[PDB]
């Protein structure tokens, strides 16, 4: 790339840019079984 210019050449005073405008997301919520109303409908136990 070789460009030579005289005393004054235009296109030395330009500005171009694409800024980001932010990033968003969501946090998933976890539900538990015993907190629901379906827990008074059965008895939960566990055998290893």
């Amino acid at each position: 790339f070789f460009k030579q210019i005289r005393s004054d050449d235009n296109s030395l005073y330009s500005a171009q840019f694409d800024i980001l405008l932010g990033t968003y997301c969501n946090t998933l919520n976890f539900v538990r079984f015993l907190e629901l109303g379906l827990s008074v409908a059965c008895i939960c136990t566990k055998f290893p």
């Binding site: 800024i19 980001l20 405008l21 932010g22």
Partner: peptide, 17 residues
């Protein structure tokens, strides 16, 4: 934007429900 990643007044206005 940012470039730091290291890794009131009472106004009269009606309100309904």
């Amino acid at each position: 934007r940012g470039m730091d990643d290291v890794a009131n007044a009472r106004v009269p206005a009606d309100l309904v429900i």
